[PDB]
Design a protein around this ligand. Structure first.
Ligand SMILES: [Cl-]
Ligand SMILES: [Cl-]
Ligand SMILES: [Cl-]
Ligand SMILES: [Cl-]
Ligand SMILES: [Cl-]
Ligand SMILES: [Cl-]
Ligand SMILES: [Cl-]
Ligand SMILES: [Cl-]
Ligand SMILES: [Cl-]
Length: 275
């Protein structure tokens, strides 16, 4: 192009878009200052749109969940995994219940049978922490979504929306991203009288940065490495970096290898999300 190259950063829309606009707009400015290239945050309206925009080149660098990042990489030969938060290596879901539902804390996976007959909400259909891994753990206890009230699960579309519909009593129970839950409790965004945690899943890997191939052709030899180092270099030294790391609820970003997503890919194929 006679136009100078711009890096398009995206993220799955996993929470309130106002909070994501603040986070990714601050991050785009931080990456822009560290790389000396124009960086823009481009929002998408749902999880699949992030996969699709990445596959077709509408996004260059995307904050994906486990399932969406595995999908994006399988459909985009040469895409690479750059980084994840410290917390993404040992991620969990919380199962939450409205305190009028009569659900008690569960002490084992086998106790998930208590959710039979209950109005249950997942997050996005494509969510690792909000759908895929919760559905996986439910299946191990012998619970399938057909056994919920109405013969199916709700899909709220986001971790924030799962808290909202359980808190409101529209659903009795749901599952979501533990970091979003913990940040919501700490911020006063959830009424802990109305909503409580009844179970935490075992650990799995979840969020990661995925980058399109051939960025070095657009931005120059070494750019992809410099981009990775910029993410890995984020540190709570300036107000802007403190804000980014606060909103990610991370102390740092760390390297990650594609091979650590093999278990997520397997669950995705078992539950029919990956063809
Ligand atoms: Cl460009
Ligand atoms: Cl552009
Ligand atoms: Cl795929
Ligand atoms: Cl689905
Ligand atoms: Cl089912
Ligand atoms: Cl369902
Ligand atoms: Cl439903
Ligand atoms: Cl290249
Ligand atoms: Cl840097």
């Amino acid at each position: 192009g006679p136009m100078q190259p711009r890096l398009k950063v995206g993220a799955i829309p996993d929470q309130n878009p106002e909070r994501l606009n603040r986070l990714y707009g601050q991050l785009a400015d931080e990456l822009s200052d560290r790389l000396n290239v124009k960086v823009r945050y481009v929002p998408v309206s749902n999880y699949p749109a992030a996969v699709s925009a990445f596959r077709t080149g509408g996004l260059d660098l995307v904050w994906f969940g486990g399932l969406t990042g595995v999908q994006a990489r399988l459909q985009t030969p040469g895409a690479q995994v750059l980084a994840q938060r410290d917390i993404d290596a040992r991620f969990r879901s919380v199962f939450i219940a409205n305190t009028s539902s009569g659900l008690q804390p569960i002490s084992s996976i086998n106790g998930l049978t208590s959710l039979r007959g209950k109005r249950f909400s997942f997050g996005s259909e494509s969510s690792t922490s909000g759908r895929l891994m919760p559905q996986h753990f439910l299946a191990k206890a012998g619970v399938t979504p057909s056994q919920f009230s109405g013969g199916r699960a709700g899909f709220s579309g986001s971790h924030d929306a799962t808290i909202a519909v359980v808190q409101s009593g529209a659903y009795e129970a749901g599952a979501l991203n533990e970091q979003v839950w913990t940040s919501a409790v700490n911020d006063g965004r959830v009424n802990t009288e109305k909503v409580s945690v009844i179970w935490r899943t075992p650990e799995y890997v979840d969020y990661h940065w995925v980058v399109r191939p051939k960025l070095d052709q657009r931005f120059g030899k070494g750019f992809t490495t410099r981009l990775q180092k910029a993410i890995l270099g984020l540190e709570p030294t300036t107000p802007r970096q403190v804000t980014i790391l606060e909103l990610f609820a991370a102390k740092r970003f760390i390297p990650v290898e594609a091979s650590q997503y093999k278990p997520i890919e397997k669950v995705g194929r078992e539950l029919g999300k990956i063809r």
